[PDB]
From Swiss-Prot, chain B:
The modification Phosphoserine is found at residues 9, 49, 56. Component of the 20S core proteasome complex involved in the proteolytic degradation of most intracellular proteins. This complex plays numerous essential roles within the cell by associating with different regulatory particles. Associated with two 19S regulatory particles, forms the 26S proteasome and thus participates in the ATP-dependent degradation of ubiquitinated proteins. This is Proteasome subunit alpha type-5. The modification Phosphothreonine is found at residue 48. Expressed in fetal brain (at protein level). Its main location: cytoplasm.
UniProtKB/Swiss-Prot annotation, chain D:
Phosphorylated on tyrosine residues; which may be important for nuclear import. It is found in: Cytoplasm; Nucleus. It comes from the Eukaryota. The gene is PSMA2. Belongs to the peptidase T1A family. It comes from Homo sapiens (Human). The modification Phosphoserine is found at residues 3, 10, 12. SUPFAM superfamilies: N-terminal nucleophile aminohydrolases (Ntn hydrolases) (SSF56235). Induction: Down-regulated by antioxidants BO-653 and probucol. Down-regulated in response to enterovirus 71 (EV71) infection (at protein level). The modification Phosphotyrosine is found at residues 2, 20, 72, 117. Pfam families: Proteasome (PF00227), Proteasome_A_N (PF10584). The 26S proteasome consists of a 20S proteasome core and two 19S regulatory subunits. The 20S proteasome core is a barrel-shaped complex made of 28 subunits that are arranged in four stacked rings. The two outer rings are each formed by seven alpha subunits, and the two inner rings are formed by seven beta subunits. The proteolytic activity is exerted by three beta-subunits PSMB5, PSMB6 and PSMB7. One of its GO terms (cellular component) is secretory granule lumen. This is Proteasome subunit alpha type-2.
Curated annotation (Swiss-Prot), chain E:
The keyword Nucleus applies. Changing residue 152 to F: Displays impaired G1/S transition and S/G2 progression. GO terms for biological process: proteasome-mediated ubiquitin-dependent protein catabolic process. The modification Phosphotyrosine is found at residue 152. Coiled coil: none annotated. This is Proteasome subunit alpha type-7. It is found in: Cytoplasm; Nucleus. The modification N6-acetyllysine is found at residue 226. Induction: Down-regulated by the ribozyme Rz3'X. Up-regulated in colorectal cancer tissues. GO terms for cellular component: cytoplasm; cytosol; extracellular exosome; nucleoplasm; nucleus; proteasome complex; proteasome core complex; proteasome core complex, alpha-subunit complex. The gene is PSMA7.
UniProtKB/Swiss-Prot annotation, chain G:
This is 26S proteasome regulatory subunit 7. Belongs to the AAA ATPase family. Component of the 19S proteasome regulatory particle complex. The 26S proteasome consists of a 20S core particle (CP) and two 19S regulatory subunits (RP). The regulatory particle is made of a lid composed of 9 subunits, a base containing 6 ATPases including PSMC2 and few additional components. Interacts with NDC80/HEC; this interaction is detected only during M phase. Interacts and SQSTM1. Interacts with PAAF1. Directly interacts with TRIM5. Monoubiquitinated by RNF181.
Length: 248, 228, 240, 230, 239, 238, 85, 239, 238
């Protein structure tokens, strides 16, 4: 039994606690970052579809902290909340000492260093939260990144985290698009990937939360989709699959 | 009865630092001899890779020009003790404007050695040999993770230290000249460690009362090579 | 067993066995008695001769640092010295702040609270001695106190701690402490010391006495058996 | 086993210790909280091991502002400590932002508080789950905070022992267009379903948040509303 | 006694926990660096950035100062925090001390950092090792490596476990006491080591070469492929 | 056994076996001898060797010109208490400029050693000590134990094989009180010889002496002082 | 009744045991057993037996129907240093 | 149940207060019993002062304490912890009067003590106080109150209450008594408490066996009844 | 479920029906099978069925006896099952719930590596949950595929109903299609359960009931057992 504490090493040289954390996000959600151009989006599904849950904040998976930053969340809710507030504080400090927007990579690496520090020291537990962010800055513009409890940040053209991640990444390899891959094509791909990852047919709009950032508004804007536009996207996917059935 | 240093064993011993003594065994052997002509220290290398820089192993290191030092143990705690020794000697000079006598170095180093379980950690798995030529003439001392220190006419510490120590006891006496003591240490090392001795697999250091500088030996081992 | 290892670990039923172990360890120590007369308090302690390496008066168990308090122990001597130090510190604190003598009730209360405080935290253990507290105050009355390693203290007309507990309690019961003066109390104390297992299984023992009263201006002094040897011979009056 | 320490994960990626704290939440006295079009209702039940108590000497429903209602289901002492720290946090926010605590701000801050006890083995998380109702921007709202250190919103909710039947009742009975008095009636009905014995003013206390302010029902109001429940 | 604690000795004196740190490094990928006639050259391999993942975020190499760069193998989080610590240390020492920094001081600093974070309970040691390159040994090049046990040494060429077992043996068989003739033969020997490495396809292999008088230089994939083809041809006429 | 954690664990038997193990660690030390007259205090030590090319471990440490100590145990704690007593002697010389009486210093060491016995996080100071000191109140020969207890002994001996010595000092205590310094050191040497094995004998190399007096400051009497006192030692008959 | 203590052989003991085992083996009667023994560290008597057997193995691998002193040396390095690695 | 009860901070799989119940069991070991009863304008406390021996002075073994000149207190538990918590209550009342100026009612005092007890329950550094709390006090123009606080930190007011060993029996007696609305005056209240206790212990008490305290609207000064007053009350019940 | 039948047949039924193919193409015959899916849901129902169609001896082993947990006989009991199976060749060995100690795991791996396929003797070991151990077992010479058991689909659950629907009677219009869609994500045995719980609902009226309405509440009491804490689990894990 060499899995008790985060600060010990096992005779095969692995960290069972951090692996347990990865498996903890293994059933967290199905949040994804879409491969897109002219605009970048996040797609999230909520396992809280219910007749009485209120969703008062109009969003429980997405959280926006900038005029050019936003994040999608899948993991332990308390850890997720403290991490998002910590990101807000880091952005505030960087804007105060630089009077300049933070680079996305510097911010995410700072968070990953904090997470690694939280894992390294004794009596402390890894944040079992993996969350996806997007941002536009003066270093690399359109940017999409992923972070994990161990303190590692993953840069991806497209990625998905949470449950059934294998199917999502496999199809994103298969249904991959490059370059000209507009935001609307990203909406179609996100719709398809969530329909396959979920067991549902005719994916209901209230079971998905999607936000995006657009740069034709080059002063920069971030939008969170409402129910009607998502339902229209669902109808478009349904007519696409109906046409595919007509292709026989 | 092994959880920590701050627990007494049924016999009164400590089965936590007695293993720190056992850690000396896994370290390389080193030879130290005190002679009226001078103090010499010998260190075994067992070349690990030709790509290594041979001097990169700090098992022979100087804390001041009037004194010598040698190591047998984990090189990390070794470097910690080495740095602590240099710091105490330099501060002693800074305050008193004189050389720190080797006995005071050995005593003052040991206070850091006495921090495993008495402040507010773990004993450093390193055993050291000091050699100094000062106001009390030529001196050679030995100190171990338990914190005890002893003035030594000769000493061998590390792996295979027991046989080398026994043979040295059979040959050595406290009235030799330095050169024959070095020769005895060299033949003992040649016997024990690998093969025919050379600068690659053995290191030598020696300081003298009339030469309170440069214990180190750099390719003057060639005389040893042609002799022994 | 199991819920035993720490002073802060409650038993599944009842109290912590750590405290019980402390008081039973007190039970096996050298005996100490203390009896108070109308205006004064007298203590009695038996001490073991160690070997002849002993120095006829060394490592004694009678300690007194207070302008009106005498104090003797029955337990492990190291914790006895430590508790004497805590009592001295508390007495000095009271004398410095309040400016006048502490009531023995309040002093024993604070000392016993500290003792019990050494039982609350898991990093610290209960003490290994039980001691008695003796004093007189001209202002309000005459007092005697008994404090255990469990942090529990009471006042007694007379009490006895050591490997004589119940027998020495009975020897106290035969007395008439309400009206007797401390001069007879010394004789009865020494005799009681000698009757209750002086050297039955033990080789031999040493006796020392303590005596604080109004007659001695409230202050404590060791009654000298170097003079008059009257309680000493009174004890030998009881051998047959 | 893995519940011995809170600082470690299970191989299943679960915190066993946090779960058992939520079992103490199930051991708590059931509380029913639902929102109406004109306000929110928080209802709870009490019983006494003997009639010797002063059943009005304490209150289970507590406010955090003049317009906030708050009810729990757990052990009393941890609830009271959390209430004290929540009131102090609301006062600090009032000092800082010169405004009373918003419901969302209050719930996130108190959940972060209840997360503060979810680290290190020397401390233990509250065995208390909170129901919070309040008025904000002219509309009624309600949420819930649990020992996990998180929060979720709820148009209709209840928790405690025998809570699943309360969930079923709320699913089959609650609609989003209910009225405040009918909301109180639904709350007392589902509390009666949730707990056995007659429900009287000695047994239930209810707090209702009105947009102007929040008040707790008086014993005579409890007697009146509990009587003639349909 | 057993290995369940950081500060506990084994009954024969071993510290199994730091050995487990070294082994956790040993599972980490290939990392081999050499110092040539004047230049120091390194080669990053086994990145295997799969399609959707971008190679920019991989950080195959990070430069601490203009005369020292590092990448580490093992855990990327520990590698990153040690990178930040070394960067801050070197920059602050050069800015504050009356005289500037040399690679020996930062070597001592990182060795001390590993020894420190290894020294007490409640504080996990780094699971990373790295091979240090310095330019200012009085202008001469020099090469170190670092280890989780807080251990460092100087080499003419060094490798770590996954790359060690094959590549390092290949070097000790091949390494000429004559320093590789010019940076050309330095890169040739690095490419030969990469040939001794697992896959050598060039899909993820990248190299950074530092001349010990010039600052660090980064090699493009096209030049790496050209060098690999040149080495393959050289093996081809070697028949 | 469950009951061998830190000294915080009270045994059901009314003991704390860590403390008993500390007493055994005292018995782990080599033989020591301590004895006084009405005018002098002398402690005699047996310096354990290591080899024919290494020096014997010293046993007598200097704390102050009027108080001397002799150690038996793990030398680390021995030196730590030695530094402690040095510091307290210096503070006593600093505050009122008065040589510190033995009894008060020994009480301070008792309190200091007792604090670990109650508190987790530090093993009690596990070394046996012999103390020789003279002050304006009287001559003193003392011993202390890791149980944070101390004993004033007319004549005392701790370590392995010490019981034969203890018998010697117990038999002869009818003699020392007014014996001269030479007679007292001869008595100490005779006491040391009792603990000796049949195959080993006293010499300057392994014998250490320490003397303090009312008109003689405490100094450590090593080989040079051992050389004259060796004469007059009782023989080894059968 | 009686406790009998067994210790690792000294140089004399090592020479004697080498004489004992090598006597039955096919060797040249010219070997310096004392050199082998003093070359031998605190190695147990079982180590002496195993070293003699390994010297015989070294001889067998060359099909030499006599062992050599060289075989004894190489066996000493093999066994002693291979464990002492 | 077993195993997870060894520490106060560890929740058992059922999620139960096992160490709290162990503190209660530590309470019940001391063979004692107390009761507090509320009247129309009076509050009455009485406890069994079971003197174990005569050589002690009866003044030194009291279990009724005055924490405020108008507030009463009564113990059940080990002597040391009871003394500690009465000292803490006195300190808390004094600090409240120092900070706020005006009165600290029994409600605030018991609530504060229960809160602090919950704090020691929450942190594993120190063992919870294994004794119970009962108080009496007069309130501003409303009437007397009886409050009970326990090691668990539970805190509430009481028309009648009991503590000690004899919990269920005493509470049943009080419950049988209180069902009828009547003029529960001072004499009737104290008589009811005394007879409750005399049946639950089932002994014809001598006066030294008990201690009686009372606070009333007409006499807000908390009083501890003398032995002669105890005899007067006993002969009042003698009818 | 249909995909399960084909791959198990290709890996069990096929090595039974045509051994000439594997010798003609010079391969070592496939040796092991491992099943992923929710517990049961055709897991055992498949293994029992394939043995009937091959007429080989079926061995049933629960996960419970696998985990004796007091070093019961795990060392040799595995062999005793194996040797008897060889005695009754051709035979099929089945174990279930491997997730329900390490030493006998190594024992099984060695036997899995060692026994000969010369007797058409194969191992089908089944699991319910995704475990870290399970991914380690997929090794050369031990297991060759990853058959998955998904939750039955709408029409799939309808077929499950129809399997047990032969015995049950019906009204003048029982549309099982509409009944089928009321349990999204329900497992297989639960679809039997709704038929099972429709069972004593016939006893709720003590006559032939099997009514369309019956299943509507025969759904009701079935789902809650597949439920309850799952509602809290959201508020628990979040
Ligand atoms: N796809 C299915 N079709 C019909 N019945 C099924 C199906 N899956 C499971 N069952 C039911 O499950 C029972 C067989 O046990 P099963 O669930 O297959 O494995 P286990 O014995 O491990 O639970 C049968 O009684 C059968 O009615």
């Amino acid at each position: 039994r060499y899995d008790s504490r985060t600060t010990i090493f096992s005779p095969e040289g692995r960290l069972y606690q951090v692996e347990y954390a990865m498996e903890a996000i293994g059933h967290a959600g199905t949040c994804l970052g879409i491969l897109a151009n002219d605009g970048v989006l996040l797609a999230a599904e909520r396992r809280n579809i219910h007749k009485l849950l209120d969703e008062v904040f109009f969003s429980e998976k997405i959280y926006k902290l900038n005029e050019d930053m936003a994040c999608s969340v899948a993991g332990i809710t308390s850890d997720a909340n403290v991490l998002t507030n910590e990101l807000r504080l880091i952005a505030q400090r960087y804007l105060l000492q630089y009077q300049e927007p933070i680079p996305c990579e510097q911010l995410v690496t700072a968070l990953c260093d904090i997470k690694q520090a939280y894992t390294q020291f004794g009596g402390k537990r890894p944040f079992g939260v993996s969350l996806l962010y997007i941002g536009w800055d003066k270093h690399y513009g359109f940017q999409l990144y992923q972070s994990d409890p161990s303190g590692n940040y993953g840069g991806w053209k497209a990625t998905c985290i949470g449950n059934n991640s294998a199917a999502a990444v496999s199809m994103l390899k298969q249904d991959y698009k490059e370059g000209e891959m507009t935001l609307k094509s990203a909406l179609a791909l996100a719709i398809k990937v969530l329909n396959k990852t979920m067991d549902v047919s005719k994916l209901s709009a209230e079971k998905v939360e999607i936000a995006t950032l657009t740069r034709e508004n080059g002063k920069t804007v971030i939008r969170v989709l409402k129910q009607k536009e998502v339902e229209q996207l669902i109808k478009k996917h349904e007519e696409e699959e109906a046409k595919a059935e007509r292709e026989k | 009865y092994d959880r920590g240093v701050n627990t007494f064993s049924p016999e009164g011993r400590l089965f936590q630092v007695e293993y720190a003594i056992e850690a000396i065994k896994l370290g390389s052997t080193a030879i130290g001899i005190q002679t009226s002509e001078g103090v010499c220290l010998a260190v075994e290398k067992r070349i690990t890779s030709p790509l290594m820089e041979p001097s990169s192993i700090e098992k022979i290191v100087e804390i001041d020009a009037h004194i010598g030092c040698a190591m047998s143990g984990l090189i990390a705690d070794a470097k910690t003790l080495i740095d602590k020794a240099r710091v105490e000697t330099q501060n002693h000079w800074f305050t008193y404007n004189e050389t720190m006598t080797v006995e005071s170095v050995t005593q003052a180093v040991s206070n850091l050695a006495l921090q495993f379980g008495e402040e507010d950690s773990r004993p450093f798995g390193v055993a050291l040999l000091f050699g100094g030529v000062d106001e009390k003439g030529p001196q050679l001392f030995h100190m171990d993770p338990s914190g005890t220190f002893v003035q030594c006419d000769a000493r061998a510490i590390g792996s295979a230290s027991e046989g080398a120590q026994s043979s040295l006891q059979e040959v050595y006496h406290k009235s030799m000249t330095l050169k024959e003591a070095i020769k005895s240490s060299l033949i003992i090392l040649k016997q024990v460690m690998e093969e025919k001795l050379n600068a690659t697999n053995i290191e030598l250091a020696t300081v003298q009362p009339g030469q309170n500088f440069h214990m180190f030996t750099k390719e003057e081992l060639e005389e040893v090579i042609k002799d022994i | 067993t199991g819920y035993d290892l720490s002073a802060s670990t409650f038993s599944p039923d009842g109290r912590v066995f750590q405290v019980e172990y402390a008081m039973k360890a007190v039970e096996n120590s050298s005996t100490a008695i203390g009896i108070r007369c109308k205006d004064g308090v007298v203590f009695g302690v038996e001490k073991l001769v160690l070997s002849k390496l002993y120095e006829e008066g060394s490592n004694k168990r009678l300690f007194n640092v207070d302008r009106h308090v005498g104090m003797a122990v029955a337990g492990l001597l190291a914790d006895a010295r430590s508790l004497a130090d805590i009592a001295r510190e508390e007495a000095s604190n009271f004398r410095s702040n309040f400016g006048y003598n502490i009531p023995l009730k309040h002093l024993a209360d604070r000392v016993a609270m500290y003792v019990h405080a050494y039982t609350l935290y898991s990093a610290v253990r209960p003490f290994g001695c039980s001691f008695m507290l003796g004093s007189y105050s001209v202002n309000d009355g005459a007092q005697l106190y008994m404090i255990d390693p469990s942090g529990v203290s009471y006042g007694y007309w007379g009490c006895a701690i050591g490997k004589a507990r119940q027998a020495a309690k009975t020897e106290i019961e035969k007395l008439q402490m309400k009206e007797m003066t401390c001069r007879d109390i010394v004789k009865e104390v020494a005799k009681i010391i000698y009757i209750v297992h002086d050297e039955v299984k033990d080789k031999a023992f040493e006796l020392e006495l303590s005596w604080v009263g109004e007659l001695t201006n409230g202050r404590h002094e060791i009654v000298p058996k170097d003079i008059r040897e009257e309680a000493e011979k009174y004890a030998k009056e009881s051998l047959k | 086993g893995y519940s011995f320490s809170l600082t470690t994960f299970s191989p299943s990626g679960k915190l066993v210790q946090i779960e058992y704290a939520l079992a103490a939440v199930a051991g708590g006295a059931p509380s029913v909280g639902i929102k109406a079009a004109n306000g929110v209702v928080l209802a709870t039940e009490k019983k006494q091991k003997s009639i010797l108590y002063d059943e009005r000497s304490v209150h289970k429903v507590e406010p955090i502002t003049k317009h906030i209602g708050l009810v729990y289901s757990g052990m009393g002492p941890d609830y009271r400590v959390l209430v004290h720290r929540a009131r102090k946090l609301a006062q600090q926010y009032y000092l800082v932002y010169q405004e009373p605590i918003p419901t969302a701000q209050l719930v996130q801050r108190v959940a972060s508080v209840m997360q503060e006890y979810t680290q290190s083995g020397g401390v233990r998380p509250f065995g208390v789950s909170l129901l919070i109702c309040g008025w904000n921007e002219g509309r009624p709202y309600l949420f819930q905070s649990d020992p996990s250190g998180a929060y979720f919103a709820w148009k209709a909710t209840a928790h405690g022992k025998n809570y699943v039947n309360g969930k079923t009742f709320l699913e089959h009975h609650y609609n989003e267009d209910l009225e405040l008095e009918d909301a109180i009636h639904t709350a007392i009905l589902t509390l009666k379903e949730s707990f056995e014995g007659q429900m009287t003013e000695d047994n239930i206390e209810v707090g209702i948040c009105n947009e102007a302010g929040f008040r707790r029902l008086t014993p005579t109001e409890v007697k009146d509303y509990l009587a003639a429940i349909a | 006694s057993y290995d369940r604690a950081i500060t506990v000795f084994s009954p024969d004196g071993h510290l199994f926990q730091v050995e487990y740190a070294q082994e956790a490094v040993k599972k980490g990928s290939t990392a081999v660096g050499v110092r040539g006639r004047d230049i120091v050259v390194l080669g990053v391999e086994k990145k295997s950035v799969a399609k959707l993942q971008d190679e920019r975020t991989v950080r195959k190499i990070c430069a601490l100062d203009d005369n020292v760069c590092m990448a580490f193998a093992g855990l990327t989080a520990d590698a990153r925090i040690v990178i930040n610590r070394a960067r801050v240390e070197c920059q602050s020492h050069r800015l504050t001390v009356e005289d500037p920094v040399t690679v020996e001081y930062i070597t001592r600093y990182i060795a001390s950092l590993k020894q420190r974070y290894t020294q007490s309970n409640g504080r996990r040691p780094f699971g990373i090792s790295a091979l240090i390159v310095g330019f200012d040994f009085d202008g001469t090049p020099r090469l170190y490596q670092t280890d989780p046990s807080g251990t460092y040494h100087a080499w003419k060429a060094n490798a770590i476990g996954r790359g060690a077992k094959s590549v390092r043996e290949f070097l000790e068989k091949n390494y000429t006491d004559e320093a590789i003739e010019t940076d050309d033969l330095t890169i040739k020997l690095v490419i030969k080591a990469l040939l001794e490495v697992v896959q050598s396809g060039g899909k993820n292999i990248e190299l950074a070469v530092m001349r010990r008088d010039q600052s660090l230089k980064i090699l493009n994939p096209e030049e790496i492929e050209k060098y690999v083809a040149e080495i393959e041809k050289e093996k081809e006429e070697n028949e | 056994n469950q009951y061998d954690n830190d000294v915080t664990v009270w045994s059901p038997q009314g003991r704390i076996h860590q403390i008993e193990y500390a007493m055994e660690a005292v018995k782990q030390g080599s033989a020591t001898v301590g004895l006084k007259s009405k005018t002098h205090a002398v402690l005699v030590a047996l310096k354990r060797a290591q080899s024919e090319l290494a020096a014997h471990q010293k046993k007598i440490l200097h704390v102050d010109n009027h108080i001397g100590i002799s150690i038996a145990g793990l030398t680390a704690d021995a030196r730590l208490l030695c530094n402690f007593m040095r510091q307290e002697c210096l503070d006593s010389r600093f505050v009122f400029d008065r040589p510190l009486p033995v009894s008060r210093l020994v009480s301070l060491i008792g309190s200091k050693t007792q604090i670990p016995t109650q508190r987790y996080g530090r093993r009690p100071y596990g070394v046996g000590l012999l103390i020789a000191g003279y002050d304006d109140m009287g001559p003193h020969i003392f011993q202390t134990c890791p149980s944070a207890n101390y004993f004033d002994c007319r004549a005392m001996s701790i370590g392995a094989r010490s019981q034969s010595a203890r018998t010697y000092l117990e038999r002869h205590m009818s003699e020392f009180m007014e014996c001269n310094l030479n007679e007292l050191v001869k008595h100490g040497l005779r006491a040391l010889r009792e603990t000796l094995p049949a195959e080993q004998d006293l010499t300057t190399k392994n014998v250490s002496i320490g003397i303090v007096g009312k008109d003689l400051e405490f100094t450590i009497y090593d080989d040079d002082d051992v050389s004259p006192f060796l004469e007059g030692l009782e023989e080894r008959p059968q | 009744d009686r406790k009998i203590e067994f210790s690792l052989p000294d140089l004399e003991g090592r020479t004697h045991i080498f004489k004992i085992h090598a006597r039955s083996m096919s060797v040249e009667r010219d070997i310096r057993f004392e050199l082998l023994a003093r070359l031998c560290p605190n190695s147990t008597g079982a180590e002496i037996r195993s070293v003699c057997t390994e010297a015989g193995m070294f001889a067998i691998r060359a099909r030499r129907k006599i062992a050599t002193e060289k075989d004894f040396l190489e066996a000493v390095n093999k066994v002693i240093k291979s464990y002492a690695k | 149940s077993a195993g997870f009860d060894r520490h106060i901070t560890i929740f058992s799989p059922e999620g139960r207060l096992y160490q709290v119940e162990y503190a209660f069991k530590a309470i019940n070991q001391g063979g004692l019993t107390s009761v507090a009863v509320r009247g129309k304008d009076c509050a009455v406390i009485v406890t069994q002062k079971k003197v174990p021996d005569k050589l002690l002075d009866s003044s030194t073994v009291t279990h009724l304490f005055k924490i405020t000149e108008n507030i009463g207190c009564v113990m059940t538990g080990m002597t040391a912890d009871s003394r500690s918590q009465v000292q803490r209550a006195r300190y808390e009342a004094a600090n409240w009067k120092y900070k706020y100026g005006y009165e600290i009612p029994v409600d605030m005092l018991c609530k504060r003590i229960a809160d602090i007890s919950q704090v020691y329950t929450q942190n594993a550094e120190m063992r919870p106080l294994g004794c119970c709390m009962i108080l009496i006090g007069i309130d501003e123009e409303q009437g007397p109150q009886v409050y009970k606080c326990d090691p668990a930190g539970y805190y509430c007011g009481f028309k009648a209450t009991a503590a000690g060993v004899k919990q269920t029996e005493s509470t049943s007696f009080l419950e049988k008594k209180v069902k009828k609305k009547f003029d529960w005056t001072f004499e009737q209240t104290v008589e009811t408490a005394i007879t409750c206790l005399s049946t639950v212990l089932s002994i014809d008490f001598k006066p030294s066996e008990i201690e009686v305290g009372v606070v009333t609207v007409e006499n807000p000064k908390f009083r501890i009844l003398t032995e002669a007053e105890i005899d007067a009350h006993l002969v009042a019940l003698a009818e | 479920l249909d995909k399960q039948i084909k791959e198990i047949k290709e890996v069990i039924e096929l090595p039974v029906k045509h051994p000439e193919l594997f010798e003609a193409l010079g391969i070592a015959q496939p040796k092991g099978v491992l099943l992923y899916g929710p517990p049961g849901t055709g897991k055992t129902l498949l293994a029992r069925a394939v043995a009937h169609h091959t007429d080989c001896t079926f061995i049933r082993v629960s996960g419970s006896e696998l985990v004796q947990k007091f070093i019961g006989e795990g060392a040799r009991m595995v062999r005793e099952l194996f040797v008897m199976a060889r005695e009754h060749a051709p035979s099929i060995i089945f174990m279930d719930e491997i997730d329900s100690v390490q030493r006998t795991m190594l024992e099984l791996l060695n036997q899995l590596d060692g026994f000969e396929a010369t007797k058409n003797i194969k191992v089908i070991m089944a699991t319910n949950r995704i475990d870290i151990l399970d991914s380690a077992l997929l090794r050369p010479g031990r297991i060759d595929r990853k058959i998955e058991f998904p939750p039955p689909n709408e029409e799939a659950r309808l077929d499950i109903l129809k399997i047990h629907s032969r015995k049950m009677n019906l009204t003048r219009g029982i549309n099982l299609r509409k009944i089928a869609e009321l349990m999204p994500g329900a497992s297989g045995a639960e679809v039997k359960g709704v038929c099972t719980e429709a069972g004593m609902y016939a006893l709720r009226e003590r006559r032939v009931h099997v009514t369309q309405e019956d299943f509507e509440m025969a759904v009701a009491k079935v789902m809650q057992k597949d439920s309850e804490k799952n509602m809290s689990i959201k508020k628990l894990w979040k």
